From a paper:
PRPP is formed from ATP and D-ribose-5-phosphate (R5P) by the phosphoribosyl pyrophosphate synthetases (PRSs). The human PRS family, which has 3 isoforms (hPRS1, hPRS2 and hPRS3), belongs to the class I PRSs that requires divalent metal ions such as Mg2+ as the activator, inorganic phosphate ion for activity, and ATP or dATP as the diphosphoryl donor. Due to the important role of PRPP in the nucleotide metabolic process, the stability of PRPP content is essential for cell physiology and is predominantly controlled by hPRS1, the ubiquitously expressed human PRPP synthetase. Mutations in hPRS1 affect vital cell functions and are related to many diseases and disorders.
We determined the crystal structures of the E43T, D65N, A87T, M115T and [name] mutations at a resolution of 3.0 Å, 2.14 Å, 3.3 Å, 2.11 Å and 2.74 Å, respectively, with 2 molecules in each asymmetric unit. Overall, the structures of all the five structures are highly similar to that of the wild type [name] with RMSD listed in S2 Table. In the [name] structure, the Gln133 replaced by Pro133 destroys the hydrogen bond interaction between Gln133 and Asp98 in the [name], which might reduce the restraint of the catalytic flexible loop. The MD simulation result indicates that there are fewer contacts between the Pro133 in [name] mutant and the catalytic flexible loop. The [name] mutant influences the catalytic flexible loop due to the loss of hydrogen bonds, consequently results in a loss of function.
Author numbering:
A (entry chain A), C (entry chain A), E (entry chain A): 3 to 195, 203 to 312
B (entry chain B), D (entry chain B), F (entry chain B): 3 to 196, 204 to 317
The structure:
Amino acid sequence: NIKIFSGSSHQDLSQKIADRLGLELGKVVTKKFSNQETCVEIGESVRGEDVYIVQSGCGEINDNLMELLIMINACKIASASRVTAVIPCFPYARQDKKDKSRAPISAKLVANMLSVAGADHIITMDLHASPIQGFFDIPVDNLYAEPAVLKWIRENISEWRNCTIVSPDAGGAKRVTSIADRLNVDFALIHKEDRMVLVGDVKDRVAILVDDMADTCGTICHAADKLLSAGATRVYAILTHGIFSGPAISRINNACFEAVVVTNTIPQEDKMKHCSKIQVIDISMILAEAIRRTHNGESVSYL
Amino acid sequence: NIKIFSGSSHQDLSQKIADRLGLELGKVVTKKFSNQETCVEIGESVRGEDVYIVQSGCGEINDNLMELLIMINACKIASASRVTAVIPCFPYARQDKKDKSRAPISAKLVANMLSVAGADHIITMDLHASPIQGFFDIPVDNLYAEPAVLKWIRENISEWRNCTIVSPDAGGAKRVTSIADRLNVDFALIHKERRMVLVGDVKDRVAILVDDMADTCGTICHAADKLLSAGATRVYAILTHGIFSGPAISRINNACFEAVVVTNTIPQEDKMKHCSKIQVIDISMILAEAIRRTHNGESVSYLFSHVP
Amino acid sequence: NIKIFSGSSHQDLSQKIADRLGLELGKVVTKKFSNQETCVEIGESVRGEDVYIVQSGCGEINDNLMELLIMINACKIASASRVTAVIPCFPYARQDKKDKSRAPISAKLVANMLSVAGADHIITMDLHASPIQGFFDIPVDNLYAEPAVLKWIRENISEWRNCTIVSPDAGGAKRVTSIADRLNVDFALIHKEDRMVLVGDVKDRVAILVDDMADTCGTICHAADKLLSAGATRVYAILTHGIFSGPAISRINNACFEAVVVTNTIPQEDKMKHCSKIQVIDISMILAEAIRRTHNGESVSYL
Amino acid sequence: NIKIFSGSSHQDLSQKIADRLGLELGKVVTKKFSNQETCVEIGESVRGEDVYIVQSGCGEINDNLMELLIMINACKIASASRVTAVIPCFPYARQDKKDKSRAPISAKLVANMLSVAGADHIITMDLHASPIQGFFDIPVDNLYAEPAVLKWIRENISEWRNCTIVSPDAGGAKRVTSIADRLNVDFALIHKERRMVLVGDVKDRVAILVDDMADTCGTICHAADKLLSAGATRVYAILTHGIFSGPAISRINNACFEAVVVTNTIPQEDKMKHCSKIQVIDISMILAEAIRRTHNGESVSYLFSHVP
Amino acid sequence: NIKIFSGSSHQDLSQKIADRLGLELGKVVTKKFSNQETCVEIGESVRGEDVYIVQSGCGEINDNLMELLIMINACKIASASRVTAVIPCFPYARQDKKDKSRAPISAKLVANMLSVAGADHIITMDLHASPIQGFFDIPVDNLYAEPAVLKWIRENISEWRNCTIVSPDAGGAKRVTSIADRLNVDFALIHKEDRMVLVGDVKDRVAILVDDMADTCGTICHAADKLLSAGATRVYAILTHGIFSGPAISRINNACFEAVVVTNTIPQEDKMKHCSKIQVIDISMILAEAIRRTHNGESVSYL
Amino acid sequence: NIKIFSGSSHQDLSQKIADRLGLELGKVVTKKFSNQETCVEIGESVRGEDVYIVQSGCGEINDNLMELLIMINACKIASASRVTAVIPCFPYARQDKKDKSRAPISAKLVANMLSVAGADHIITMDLHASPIQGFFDIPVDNLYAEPAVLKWIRENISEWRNCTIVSPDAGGAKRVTSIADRLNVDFALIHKERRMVLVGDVKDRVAILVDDMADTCGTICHAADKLLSAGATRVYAILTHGIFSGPAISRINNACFEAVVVTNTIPQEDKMKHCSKIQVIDISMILAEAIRRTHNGESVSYLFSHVP
């Protein structure tokens, strides 16, 4: 009854999920015309089946979006019983408000686009902001990296019991306080004035920069510099969604971090090779467990 | 062309907005069925008219929301050209994410209800979480009370050049930082773990608590003690939406605030008889300016930093 | 597979339904913030389940509506397989037309609101007017009190075989003729001119005022006075939905009725104590039987 | 700005309405594919124009409805500003509730079909059941023929001050009572059990049967006998929509009516050649006034008691 | 679980389908009021059932459309689990574009109408043009007469291996080339200038006019005349959907055709009697097989 | 009232259209997040304005489509009166039917995406398959490049009175026949079986290949050889949309075309540096005329046979 397809050139998260549920990825012919046009063909019957599509991540976010949507549509009009988008890293997630601008709410657009394409259900992990669940009318099961992040800090940072979790921006206070509370450590927060400012006890104690995602690393790199000026013993970088394009990769190595943790929502294989301090948290079991429980009607709230 | 209406019998902000535009409020025949059903009649044509309905700060949120929905419908099926719901204090705004609970996202529900009732446009002020514009498909104008607040601090607080803007929770950091920056001053941040912890310098500085709303004032009072504990000279509380239900008035009067400042999105006339500390920023002109501009197609974003 | 929640402070109709199907009401935490805001939390997994919500009836119709809608939404975005609103007394049912006014069609609003909230199906009893089924695009199963009303008249009114069923208004002719036809008795009808008018043989015969609902009782009380002036032996009052607020309760006792029948669509417990002539028809078996048959795909048309 | 069109070839009411507004009917190229498919062409731009399409009383309801739907679509995808379907006699109106049967609510279906075809507005007259405005989300103007009827009774019936307004069924009580009250006279009510039973005094009074429509006239003729049986001096029948299909003309001519009065929502030109009793109230001005007002944004509710 | 209703006076295709699946057509009371108004009543419970409606074809296309839609709606609001429209001959299919006119896209209207009425799925055969699948948001399973047409040409036309398949219009090139390719024969095409023009080798070889549908036959009759002037040995006429109204019937007999093949998407029984050269391809097994496989979640792509 | 915007940085057709209407392009602040996310800002009010957004021929179709969608949304939630997406070359148009495959109908998907993003209207040119207007519910204006093509043939080809209009495939017959008829000349038809087969006379005639687009030019080059094989004097290729990706420029330069003619729906400035054969029909005036007319409510269908 259950069927899993991968949505890209990228099949390393998708294949990991299918193995854990004892399945083979669905047979799909995906091609790109010389004029950049995406061609997708479901090479099997998905009729009456419970279909799951895991998004790709070749670095290009529009191509990945379009193939995601094309696949959901291809499956819907082929009488799939239910289509879920399994999108650990929600595209355009930053654009969830106008921000004192004539700016799009692109997160709401993408939700409208996922809905109109045919999606009946969304599985995602650690949304930038949580109200993006409210952009959909369909059920959204948003998973948390929180348990997986906490487990790493406890098992890798030795001097954690008296460390400090730090937000790289103003709009990250909620997330770092929560991480701090569970570990009974202190928290701090950075705000770029541009001169950077720090608020919270960081002197002679392990500092861990936890954030949802870093693109150019420009913010998180200067965040490490500041923390070291403020006298933190050592510094870390936890980034659930690791986009890491352009100057980021090199910026991290010239940076002082003892370790830079990520989750394989975006494949670090080619970049782990160009940076040794990086470590990946496997989020496939969490995604596989959330697919089985969704298909069986079992509680995902435990996860 | 323009036509303003009010909800229930709490017609003060509506009248204030109506006054500033040189208009009368439109006639509504509205009593409640002893059954608790609301009956509305629109006592005049709205055919091809640019209608504005102002949500009433009476005090029963489900009654108010229902009446606002009923009036939006009445005008839409009476062939109004456009119905704009002017909702200074957006109901159920605090319920905008499931929050690792199995809860409804009530903000989205109210957004869907407003939409199907026939609403074409939204005018609102300082959404608890701004991302609520994303809960609609029709355009939303989210007005900032920030400018009006900054103007109040500059003239009512002498030590404003050296004060500290404080967030009572961790979800108000993006709000306190931007205010501190426009005044070019320090910011602080209180986080209640469940004890309050403060991060940022407030020693020998006036501290100004900034929030979107105050409801039982439990948090804002324990934050006043905390700030004065940490070396704050004096504590101000500034709220956009002042609900002050339950023990809040008892919370405010015994609290060590110099002053508690609220806009008149929720009426404060009675609450100032029982509480001297409460001062009111008049927002009616910002709302009036927003309606005028929406009608003439002129820039509403001009209000986002500039008090009319 | 089947799950039943109650929608209010009111759990006397809801618990009766759950007992009859051998169930416990679902665990739900409902709270009202000091600023009258409703907070609802489904304290269990409703995923893959066939969910039924029975509306509350603490006298307040907006609060009951909002919690009804909040619960349907809470269940829908928590991947409930199907949500039904079990609303014996359809809110705002009177407002099903403009009536030569710039008035809302609030019954259509409420239907739009129930739909947009997530409802897939509606169970209701004796709608004010029947076209309210046509306000929805989802299936509506409207049950009839008619069999339960007829059974009472036969088993309680001794001199029924030659009685007269009377409509308190002009727009009730259809309902009273039907009740009269099934019992092979005569019918009559009242119309307020305000001076009241009567049409139909009522002299020296049992009179039974049958209506869908009475709020202030103002109409139905003066209807009893008129019938007694026109010389009816004794007078009754059948009101499926008993709202009975404000002056109504006292108006009924100073009224001449031998009995005032209702159905427990709205709880009379506290008011039966303040009026002895009242009798309640239990509509729980009809609602419970209509839930089981809806869940099993069995015919409800028999009911 | 205004642009009126007609359906099929039954272009009399359309022309009458067009005449009263000083307009020509818009060019439509419309023949039927021998296959029974309808082909419509709009022989002119409607771009940014306020379009009105009048449903034709030709006589084949599914053909008429389809053509009305096709024309609404053509205008909408030709960038009309607004398309209003003017449907004097609303099709499938008698199917508005399931009725303890497993039947479709056809009224709602026609309402959904009109809506998705692209209709922005509805102008109609005396809906069999009024609650059909509730079957739409777009605004509906339900016109009353009542005023025109009352004016007809006052001048054509001398005994009107002492007559009795009769409902032929039990679903027409809310219609006969309101008419009786405006004339300040008695009302009666016939109920066919399945025999007719009459309640209310009609002795030595002119009796006036009032209905929304007449179709085979079975009911209205057995009601005429019944009334004269009960002591009625003479019987009139007044209908808003006069369909008169099947044996109705044979029913009318042998029936003891003094006169059978119908509006021209359904054409009566041929039916008066074969039946002398039939008199026509012209409704074209009420419809013309309704279109004019809808265009200028003036009060249409003025027509609800006042004949233009 | 499966239920089949016929949508008209016409029950010869519908009954053939039900027999092949071992079923009886659903009990339905359909009536037409003296004012041409359609009355339909589902004389049984369709609750929780997988419902299929096969359209009628009494020659009238609006009456058939309205009863089709009325039945889909009647079933949807009676809690049918799934409603499919089985419409071998898609109504208004010609009107799929404006054609340099202010013309309706009536095919899109009808799709909107089928959707809004309640349909969840469409089964159809050899659409005029294929993008009509794209007019729906629901799944559309469009079947092909191609295999059934090819089988007839091979088994009835003796000299086929060197014949020529001819399009009666310009917008039929795609269809005839495909038929020609599968049989390894040549193709030709006619275009009315009105003087007719021919392009493609037709001399002294069997000619077969293949088209989707002919109404007045005006085009296809003159197409036969031209082909005979151009010197084709014998001429045929393959028309999947045989509408054949007005002058068509007589035009075919005065025409020179050796045979005129059709499919019983539109009943030829009364007209086969008025023309002997006509032969019908039975499309009931294809429709019955497509219903069973849709209901069981099996592949229809094989068909 | 009118306001034109462009996509990405390919602002040539937008400027050309803007020039012909005596307007500047509206300010857009648009860089791409190194993450490949597009960020758009509308650097001016669009409140109550008739907005037009021109899809950019930059070359990355999913980026272009996304940016077009993002800009449509930005304008809609900034209370524009109307947003019209001007899409000369409609993306994913070749995917309009499943084609006995289990494929998406991408045309409909793009149509749904444009619709929910907030589009009120579509202006496009020569849809690969025209039936794409049927994929929308909002009005679509499908412009013909046909007139501009016919004008090009009449003046650039001397032998046009005796030429042959050729379809490179079998899906272009309804396009080549109508063109041949307006010039009153012969038509031909190439069908690649998978070898090309030609039907129709081309002996000692100039042959003109007519298509909706050219992409790798595989087909159009093998059709040129085929035509010259069959006795064609010389071969022209005329395309509305000239994409020329992959080996097309190598395909064109070695091919026996006299000339390859394209409209400027997709920019050709660079492609003419590398290929002399390529000539450009300017379509900007047809698009400018179409926008002007859409704004003033004047007939756009006038463009369907007549070059402005």
